[PDB]
Amino acid sequence: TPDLDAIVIGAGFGGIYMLHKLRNDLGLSVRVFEKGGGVGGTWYWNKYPGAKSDTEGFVYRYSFDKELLREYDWTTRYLDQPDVLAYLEHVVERYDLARDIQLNTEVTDAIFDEETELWRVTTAGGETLTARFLVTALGLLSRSNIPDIPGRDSFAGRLVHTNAWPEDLDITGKRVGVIGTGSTGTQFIVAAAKMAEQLTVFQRTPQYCVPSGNGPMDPDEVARIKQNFDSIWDQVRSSTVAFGFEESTVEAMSVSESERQRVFQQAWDKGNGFRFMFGTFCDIATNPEANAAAAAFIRSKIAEIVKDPETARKLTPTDLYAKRPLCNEGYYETYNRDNVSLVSLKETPIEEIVPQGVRTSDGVVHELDVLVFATGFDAVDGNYRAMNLRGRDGRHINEHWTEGPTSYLGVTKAGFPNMFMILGPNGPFTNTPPSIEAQVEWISDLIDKATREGLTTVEPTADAEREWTETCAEIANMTLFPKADSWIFGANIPGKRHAVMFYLGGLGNYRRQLADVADGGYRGFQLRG
Amino acid sequence: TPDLDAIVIGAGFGGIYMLHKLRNDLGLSVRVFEKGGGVGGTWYWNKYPGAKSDTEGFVYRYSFDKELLREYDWTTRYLDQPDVLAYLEHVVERYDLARDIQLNTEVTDAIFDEETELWRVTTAGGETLTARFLVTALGLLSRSNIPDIPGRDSFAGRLVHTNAWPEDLDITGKRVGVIGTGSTGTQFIVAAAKMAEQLTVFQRTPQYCVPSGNGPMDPDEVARIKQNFDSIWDQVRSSTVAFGFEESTVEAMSVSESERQRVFQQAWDKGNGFRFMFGTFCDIATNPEANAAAAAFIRSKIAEIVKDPETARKLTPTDLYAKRPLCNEGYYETYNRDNVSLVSLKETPIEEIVPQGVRTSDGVVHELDVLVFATGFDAVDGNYRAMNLRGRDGRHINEHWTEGPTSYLGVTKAGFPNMFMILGPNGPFTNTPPSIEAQVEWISDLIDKATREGLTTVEPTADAEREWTETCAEIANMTLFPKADSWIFGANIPGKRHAVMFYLGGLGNYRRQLADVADGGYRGFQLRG
Numbered sequence A, B: 001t002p003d004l005d006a007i008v009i010g011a012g013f014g015g016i017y018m019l020h021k022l023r024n025d026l027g028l029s030v031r032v033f034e035k036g037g038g039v040g041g042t043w044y045w046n047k048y049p050g051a052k053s054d055t056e057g058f059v060y061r062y063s064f065d066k067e068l069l070r071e072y073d074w075t076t077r078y079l080d081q082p083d084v085l086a087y088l089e090h091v092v093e094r095y096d097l098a099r100d101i102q103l104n105t106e107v108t109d110a111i112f113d114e115e116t117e118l119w120r121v122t123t124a125g126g127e128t129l130t131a132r133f134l135v136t137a138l139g140l141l142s143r144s145n146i147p148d149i150p151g152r153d154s155f156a157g158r159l160v161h162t163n164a165w166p167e168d169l170d171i172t173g174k175r176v177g178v179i180g181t182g183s184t185g186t187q188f189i190v191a192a193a194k195m196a197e198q199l200t201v202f203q204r205t206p207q208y209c210v211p212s213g214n215g216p217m218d219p220d221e222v223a224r225i226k227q228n229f230d231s232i233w234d235q236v237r238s239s240t241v242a243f244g245f246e247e248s249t250v251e252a253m254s255v256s257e258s259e260r261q262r263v264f265q266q267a268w269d270k271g272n273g274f275r276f277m278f279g280t281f282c283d284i285a286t287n288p289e290a291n292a293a294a295a296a297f298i299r300s301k302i303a304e305i306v307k308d309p310e311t312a313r314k315l316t317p318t319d320l321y322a323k324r325p326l327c328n329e330g331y332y333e334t335y336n337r338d339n340v341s342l343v344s345l346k347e348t349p350i351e352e353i354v355p356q357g358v359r360t361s362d363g364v365v366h367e368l369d370v371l372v373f374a375t376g377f378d379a380v381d382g383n384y385r386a387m388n389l390r391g392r393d394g395r396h397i398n399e400h401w402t403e404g405p406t407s408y409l410g411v412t413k414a415g416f417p418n419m420f421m422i423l424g425p426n427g428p429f430t431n432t433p434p435s436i437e438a439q440v441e442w443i444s445d446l447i448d449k450a451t452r453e454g455l456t457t458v459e460p461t462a463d464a465e466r467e468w469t470e471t472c473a474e475i476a477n478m479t480l481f482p483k484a485d486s487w488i489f490g491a492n493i494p495g496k497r498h499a500v501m502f503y504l505g506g507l508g509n510y511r512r513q514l515a516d517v518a519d520g521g522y523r524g525f526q527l528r529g
């Protein structure tokens, strides 16, 4: 007899829906443990100015409740962090979830007991509880990456990671430095430039930023979108990246030079990063000649927008357009402001952080009241490797992951029975919520089967997991994503294994893999009862 | 304007009473942050078998409320951990405190903002709140000391510190090892011997354990004590150690051999560790001749009780009787059992922890299922030094404490305005609760003065703190305590500064110092409005 049927870790998009399925639909005893002081995951932690969705609001939400789809209003094309947090708090209120979500509670240990065949979970607060089923919704992009830049801790001002933005901090009229120009840094830079006395950007690697097209939502369009939600979610679930647009089936180099310029300009004008990469042509991420045409178009727009030719050059990337697409409102324009300076760390790397700011290699001391680390995440496997997480024969998850992190179907792990992962290693690379929905519903169905049939353990075989690794490696190596040095393949952190950590076959093909496994009596699983 | 009048850290005896004064009596807005999953401090964390008070139950409790003194019942002469925890849970219940205690919440940062003159507090859960007043009840004996014994992490069974004892762990019928024989180790050994198939004790330093005389309380005795509580508490508050017995005023060597034997035998039969040290003669802990006579009596008792002469030899300490007194029921008798073995780490030290147990320098592999670290605490300063705690000029508490931890009166710190410590460095060495009450009441009185008069800051001067260090040094250096290597002077942890960390003048003289300062216009404080 376990203390609980199920323990879920994380109260983001993943954990919130998992608890709903397990407690509300299956009638099981469940507790969520969230180490944060509120629910919302991403949208609790990322309180920094400019924090917002790069999925358009209309499809950055749950689809499973048709009444919620009819009722809930959004006012902006992309959702500000406070509005996403408000939406998730509403979902929690709507299904009476708060009473079974324990906040401020870090799970430090999860130990599979091979005698009882129960999960023994320990918290930082010194609670030990047993559960039959463990669901880890720990976040692909949850564990803060804070590089050990020499002197970092000497800084006399406010030093923060974006994923730890403190609620009291007001940068209005302060001298602000930011390190990093990914999705976090660039949206922060647009907002911060309006507030700061001076904003200094420390950029190691410029990215191919495209317009978001963000602005007010016409409430009459929101009514029409709501009219067509059934067909919109149909298209989302059958797409690769699930961003709510029809993906191009046209090869970039199959059309005229004129047509390529027109298609790119039309996506530039319409906005969205995933639209630019996948709504232009079908081979931007696979054909290197297609990739170079897309990259060239983005460089041409930078040269048009940025007035200082030195700033233009430093903003203009020359590497593969194969990092995760990013978009913003008025990013390049921000660098035309009198109070924004760009420091290329390619030219003048950081030598040392000092009480008064940042000394770069040219010996210039950038005087700062606030230093912001927009330096990203120990992505995918970060919160797994930091946990004392042990399966059969008492083996730690790290012992299994010496060649990079692994899974079966992105949701299970050989040697870890009755353990399910929401966006574990080697799952889909998409607009997040519909991928979360696919995993949570499939996991719920298998937990319901194990309940009805009296199954004591369900686990994938080592062979099924190895074949899933091979399937992900085969798909990945036909794209340019492995040659971009991003968080996606673990190349953002010194000493992290460069490895496939996603199934890159898209939501459509991912959903088919899940369905065929379930159809075939849970192919690759040993079900015991 | 702060978010809260006061933030309190810790929900042991100290934080609970401090919240009661500030919320219930002064009517301030207050929150307690406790990183533990429940209230009780010591009595939450120490879930190990045998865990119990070495203060007799009648005075191991609050005195401030006559109604609670009249009502609450205890059934054993010493309080088992579940019974002390239930008492503290009842206190939280009856005083309506739970609504203002936030569990699972570790304070990572407390930063004095010199511009606002407010404390900025950050939680591991990502809350930042401001308070005018900060009270740290972090515990003298709260931060677990776990030595880096070679191969420790390789142990294949259940390895636990006593202060992290997991609720699920049943040692019944298992091969158990324990490292340590202080108050924790010895009370655990008595309880664990009745459960374990085999209990191996890894003893580096045997101590002068005396009988507790624990057993059932006659309910007529409890009724008798409650009728006399006013005179019992008056004697406690003007005593030195506050254990509820009259302290001897007779010099051990001023009486005959026969009288020394009679007085020692009397204390031995009556029981209690502090009774033996301070209830026999006035100079056991100050006069090395008196110390020797007390030590010799205890050794003679070990020889009587322990049947195997080799075991008796290993149990018999030959160093100063100048570590904290410790008492148990049937400790030496436990070693007459067939399932208890004693390893002297003086003779055969631990060379390595291996998957199957412990290898001593005699090459013996001790085979264990469970390895218990009864290795004590980073005492007094542990939880302060681990905090990002900063005062005036942005200085970390560590920068103030390079020659050991310091305070003014054990409750304030120079450079740290509006910050108060419950059992901070250089406070009393007593039965805990009456010392906690003296400090909480003094702190409440000064916060109440500060509120009434509109004071923005209260702080001790550097000079007042330096004088308090010297006072504590003068008193400490007239005792044998500094000559014996124990947690009391920081000598239990490699690399930790050997320094005075207590005022050893006793509760009566400590209370006089607090009163003289307050009545004398807060001598040594700068009060600012």
Ligand SMILES: Cc1cc2nc3c(=O)[nH]c(=O)nc-3n(C[C@H](O)[C@H](O)[C@H](O)COP(=O)(O)OP(=O)(O)OC[C@H]3O[C@@H](n4cnc5c(N)ncnc54)[C@H](O)[C@@H]3O)c2cc1C
Pocket: A009, A010, A011, A012, A013, A014, A015, A033, A034, A035, A036, A040, A041, A042, A043, A046, A051, A052, A053, A054, A055, A056, A060, A105, A106, A107, A108, A137, A138, A139, A140, A141, A142, A184, A383, A387, A422, A423, A430, A431, A432, A433
């Ligand atoms: C600023 C920002 C904007 C983004 N915008 C988009 C977007 O527009 N579109 C998109 O598709 N994706 C976006 N993402 C990616 C984003 O991660 C997902 O959209 C989604 O929010 C993730 O939900 P989740 O529940 O999987 O994880 P999270 O929201 O990260 O939740 C995981 C939770 O687990 C908790 N946790 C982890 N380990 C433990 C532990 N051991 N014990 C207890 N709790 C633990 C964490 O505290 C966290 O709250 C964005 C990310 C960021 C940072």
Ligand SMILES: Cc1cc2nc3c(=O)[nH]c(=O)nc-3n(C[C@H](O)[C@H](O)[C@H](O)COP(=O)(O)OP(=O)(O)OC[C@H]3O[C@@H](n4cnc5c(N)ncnc54)[C@H](O)[C@@H]3O)c2cc1C
Pocket: B009, B010, B011, B012, B013, B014, B015, B033, B034, B035, B036, B040, B041, B042, B043, B046, B051, B052, B053, B054, B055, B056, B060, B105, B106, B107, B108, B137, B138, B139, B140, B141, B142, B184, B383, B387, B422, B423, B430, B431, B432, B433
């Ligand atoms: C087994 C045992 C028995 C004892 N018996 C006796 C006895 O009989 N008589 C006696 O006089 N003394 C005894 N002691 C000493 C004991 O410490 C005190 O009696 C008393 O319990 C201490 O109360 P406190 O509130 O000062 O500290 P604690 O009870 O230690 O409470 C401090 C709390 O602060 C919390 N905390 C610390 N840092 C942070 C942070 N950064 N954020 C959030 N929370 C934090 C900790 O989690 C802890 O719960 C005993 C100790 C032990 C271990």
Ligand SMILES: NC(=O)c1ccc[n+]([C@@H]2O[C@H](COP(=O)([O-])OP(=O)(O)OC[C@H]3O[C@@H](n4cnc5c(N)ncnc54)[C@H](OP(=O)(O)O)[C@@H]3O)[C@@H](O)[C@H]2O)c1
Pocket: A052, A053, A054, A055, A141, A147, A179, A180, A181, A182, A183, A184, A185, A187, A202, A203, A204, A205, A324, A327, A345, A374, A375, A376, A377, A485, A486, A487, A492
């Ligand atoms: N618009 C949105 O909705 C939004 C916003 C925030 C984040 N997100 C999500 O979160 C993901 C992560 O984005 P992110 O911007 O937080 O992280 P990221 O994409 O990994 O970017 C981190 C940035 O920090 C830099 N950096 C890392 N280590 C450094 C070091 N030692 N010195 C200097 N610079 C260093 C990186 O440069 P290098 O390339 O040289 O390593 C890069 O510019 C996104 O891809 C997206 O999925 C979304």
Ligand SMILES: NC(=O)c1ccc[n+]([C@@H]2O[C@H](COP(=O)([O-])OP(=O)(O)OC[C@H]3O[C@@H](n4cnc5c(N)ncnc54)[C@H](OP(=O)(O)O)[C@@H]3O)[C@@H](O)[C@H]2O)c1
Pocket: B052, B053, B054, B055, B141, B147, B179, B180, B181, B182, B183, B184, B185, B187, B204, B205, B324, B345, B374, B375, B376, B377, B485, B487, B492
């Ligand atoms: N009321 C009670 O019954 C009770 C019970 C528990 C604790 N307490 C309180 O808590 C305090 C702490 O007592 P405690 O027993 O937890 O700790 P302690 O008195 O500090 O004892 C620690 C023990 O561990 C040993 N040890 C430490 N490091 C070691 C190492 N590296 N290798 C081997 N042995 C090692 C010590 O021996 P060395 O000295 O040789 O290193 C000692 O025997 C008590 O003094 C008391 O105030 C009270």
Ligand code: NA
Pocket: A082, A085, A086, A089
């Ligand atoms: Na909200």
Ligand code: NA
Pocket: A429, A430, A431, A432, A433
């Ligand atoms: Na996603």
Ligand code: NA
Pocket: A117, A455, A456, A457, A528, A529
């Ligand atoms: Na089974």
Ligand code: NA
Pocket: B205, B485, B486
């Ligand atoms: Na000792």
Ligand code: NA
Pocket: B210, B211, B305, B328, B329, B330, B331, B332, B333
């Ligand atoms: Na005894």
